[PDB]
Design an enzyme around this catalytic site. Structure first.
Site, PDB file in Angstrom:
ATOM      1  N   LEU A  13      -8.145  -4.861   8.820  1.00 18.40           N
ATOM      2  CA  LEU A  13      -8.334  -3.413   8.727  1.00 18.40           C
ATOM      3  C   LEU A  13      -9.643  -2.984   9.387  1.00 18.40           C
ATOM      4  O   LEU A  13     -10.613  -3.770   9.427  1.00 18.40           O
ATOM      5  CB  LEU A  13      -8.311  -2.948   7.290  1.00 18.40           C
ATOM      6  CG  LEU A  13      -7.132  -3.391   6.372  1.00 18.40           C
ATOM      7  CD1 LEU A  13      -7.488  -3.030   4.899  1.00 18.40           C
ATOM      8  CD2 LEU A  13      -5.892  -2.710   6.915  1.00 18.40           C
ATOM      9  N   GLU A  28      -7.154   0.964  -2.845  1.00 17.18           N
ATOM     10  CA  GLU A  28      -6.168   1.331  -1.815  1.00 17.18           C
ATOM     11  C   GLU A  28      -5.127   0.235  -1.714  1.00 17.18           C
ATOM     12  O   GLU A  28      -3.908   0.509  -1.642  1.00 17.18           O
ATOM     13  CB  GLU A  28      -6.860   1.616  -0.498  1.00 17.18           C
ATOM     14  CG  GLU A  28      -6.096   2.601   0.370  1.00 17.18           C
ATOM     15  CD  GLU A  28      -4.804   2.125   1.027  1.00 17.18           C
ATOM     16  OE1 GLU A  28      -3.835   2.931   0.980  1.00 17.18           O
ATOM     17  OE2 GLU A  28      -4.739   0.991   1.534  1.00 17.18           O
TER      18      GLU A  28
HETATM   19  N1  LIG Z   1      -3.974   0.139   8.018  1.00 20.42           N
HETATM   20  C1  LIG Z   1      -2.665  -0.225   7.703  1.00 20.42           C
HETATM   21  O1  LIG Z   1      -1.988   0.434   6.915  1.00 20.42           O
HETATM   22  C2  LIG Z   1      -2.078  -1.336   8.349  1.00 20.42           C
HETATM   23  C3  LIG Z   1      -2.858  -2.140   9.138  1.00 20.42           C
HETATM   24  N2  LIG Z   1      -2.300  -3.285   9.789  1.00 20.42           N
HETATM   25  C4  LIG Z   1      -3.132  -3.900  10.837  1.00 20.42           C
HETATM   26  O2  LIG Z   1      -2.605  -3.294  12.030  1.00 20.42           O
HETATM   27  C5  LIG Z   1      -2.477  -4.190  13.095  1.00 20.42           C
HETATM   28  C6  LIG Z   1      -0.901  -4.289  13.370  1.00 20.42           C
HETATM   29  O3  LIG Z   1      -0.726  -4.790  14.666  1.00 20.42           O
HETATM   30  P1  LIG Z   1       0.415  -4.502  15.501  1.00 20.42           P
HETATM   31  O4  LIG Z   1      -0.016  -4.954  16.803  1.00 20.42           O
HETATM   32  O5  LIG Z   1       0.912  -3.149  15.398  1.00 20.42           O
HETATM   33  O6  LIG Z   1       1.480  -5.549  15.046  1.00 20.42           O
HETATM   34  P2  LIG Z   1       2.960  -5.753  14.387  1.00 20.42           P
HETATM   35  O7  LIG Z   1       2.827  -6.157  13.014  1.00 20.42           O
HETATM   36  O8  LIG Z   1       3.799  -4.657  14.720  1.00 20.42           O
HETATM   37  O9  LIG Z   1       3.361  -7.104  15.126  1.00 20.42           O
HETATM   38  C7  LIG Z   1       3.695  -7.077  16.538  1.00 20.42           C
HETATM   39  C8  LIG Z   1       4.577  -8.255  16.825  1.00 20.42           C
HETATM   40  O10 LIG Z   1       5.746  -8.058  15.968  1.00 20.42           O
HETATM   41  C9  LIG Z   1       7.024  -8.283  16.634  1.00 20.42           C
HETATM   42  N3  LIG Z   1       7.701  -6.937  16.611  1.00 20.42           N
HETATM   43  C10 LIG Z   1       7.056  -5.751  16.293  1.00 20.42           C
HETATM   44  N4  LIG Z   1       8.064  -4.827  16.292  1.00 20.42           N
HETATM   45  C11 LIG Z   1       9.277  -5.443  16.475  1.00 20.42           C
HETATM   46  C12 LIG Z   1      10.576  -5.013  16.498  1.00 20.42           C
HETATM   47  N5  LIG Z   1      10.938  -3.710  16.267  1.00 20.42           N
HETATM   48  N6  LIG Z   1      11.515  -5.934  16.692  1.00 20.42           N
HETATM   49  C13 LIG Z   1      11.273  -7.303  16.828  1.00 20.42           C
HETATM   50  N7  LIG Z   1       9.999  -7.754  16.860  1.00 20.42           N
HETATM   51  C14 LIG Z   1       9.071  -6.797  16.684  1.00 20.42           C
HETATM   52  C15 LIG Z   1       6.593  -8.763  18.015  1.00 20.42           C
HETATM   53  O11 LIG Z   1       6.502 -10.154  17.957  1.00 20.42           O
HETATM   54  P3  LIG Z   1       7.310 -11.077  18.929  1.00 20.42           P
HETATM   55  O12 LIG Z   1       6.404 -11.127  20.181  1.00 20.42           O
HETATM   56  O13 LIG Z   1       7.284 -12.392  18.250  1.00 20.42           O
HETATM   57  O14 LIG Z   1       8.615 -10.588  19.254  1.00 20.42           O
HETATM   58  C16 LIG Z   1       5.208  -8.107  18.206  1.00 20.42           C
HETATM   59  O15 LIG Z   1       4.349  -8.835  19.143  1.00 20.42           O
HETATM   60  C17 LIG Z   1      -3.264  -5.435  12.593  1.00 20.42           C
HETATM   61  O16 LIG Z   1      -4.681  -5.283  12.888  1.00 20.42           O
HETATM   62  C18 LIG Z   1      -3.054  -5.329  11.094  1.00 20.42           C
HETATM   63  O17 LIG Z   1      -4.122  -5.935  10.321  1.00 20.42           O
HETATM   64  C19 LIG Z   1      -0.873  -3.618   9.710  1.00 20.42           C
HETATM   65  C20 LIG Z   1      -0.104  -2.814   8.873  1.00 20.42           C
HETATM   66  C21 LIG Z   1      -0.610  -1.644   8.134  1.00 20.42           C
END
Ligand SMILES: NC(=O)C1=CN([C@@H]2O[C@H](COP(=O)(O)OP(=O)(O)OC[C@H]3O[C@@H](n4cnc5c(N)ncnc54)[C@H](OP(=O)(O)O)[C@@H]3O)[C@@H](O)[C@H]2O)C=CC1
Length: 186
Positions: A22, A30
């Protein structure tokens, strides 16, 4: 299967993450709010399902994985099977939501919660239908490298209050924040 929902915490500059963490220091209440909302199910013999991308999975402290009391589904096209401790793996959001209609889950899942990251938020947020967004507004700017998609207020109505969600300003570690609930139906 019950309602579809996203839940996020977001800074004023729309940040959600930085290097797999985060952007702000840990806010214990939270995270307790996140746990409570995503876990609580108003239907007997069911659990809620959490859907997340692969980076979000690996960004949850191991002590909290899988998210207890919920069915945990990870989205990935690279992985060949669920990660260690996860329950399900899907290759697309539509595939995950189809799976909830299959025999193995149709009667087990109450609320579906998309818990991150950006790309899955963006797809869900622009797909027709009934969707809520549970948004925690962190009331400061924080350096981030991953951002929440735009919320189109023409379609997402901010609710005036919602049961189980405090309406007042919260503060932890010197950081003010507030809880909001949005709803679209299109
Ligand atoms: N403040 C908050 O509420 C939240 C914060 N976080 C933070 O946010 C960031 C999230 O990173 P983010 O880059 O968005 O990552 P995601 O969690 O969305 O992960 C991305 C990876 O997920 C797979 N992917 C994502 N969407 C799909 C889909 N629709 N279908 C199939 N595979 C999919 C892919 O992997 P592949 O290449 O293997 O296909 C992609 O490289 C992090 O820093 C985390 O700590 C995360 C959630 C909530």
């Amino acid at each position: 299967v019950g309602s579809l929902n996203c839940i996020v915490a977001v800074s004023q500059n729309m940040g959600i993450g930085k290097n797999g963490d985060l952007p702000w220091p840990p806010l214990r209440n939270e995270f307790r709010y996140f746990q409570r909302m995503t876990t609580t199910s108003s239907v007997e013999g069911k659990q809620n399902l959490v859907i997340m991308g692969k980076k979000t999975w690996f960004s949850i402290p191991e002590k909290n994985r899988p998210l207890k009391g919920r069915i945990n589904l990870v989205l990935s096209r690279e992985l060949k099977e669920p990660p260690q401790g996860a329950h399900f793996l899907s290759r697309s959001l539509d595939d995950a939501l189809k799976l909830t209609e299959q025999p193995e889950l149709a009667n087990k899942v109450d609320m579906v919660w998309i818990v991150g990251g950006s790309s899955v938020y963006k797809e869900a947020m622009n797909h027709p239908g009934h969707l809520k967004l549970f948004v925690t507004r962190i009331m400061q700017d924080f350096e981030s490298d991953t951002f929440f998609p735009e919320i189109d207020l023409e379609k997402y109505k901010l609710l005036p209050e919602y049961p189980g969600v405090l309406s007042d300003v919260q503060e932890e570690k010197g950081i003010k924040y507030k809880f909001e609930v949005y709803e679209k139906n299109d």
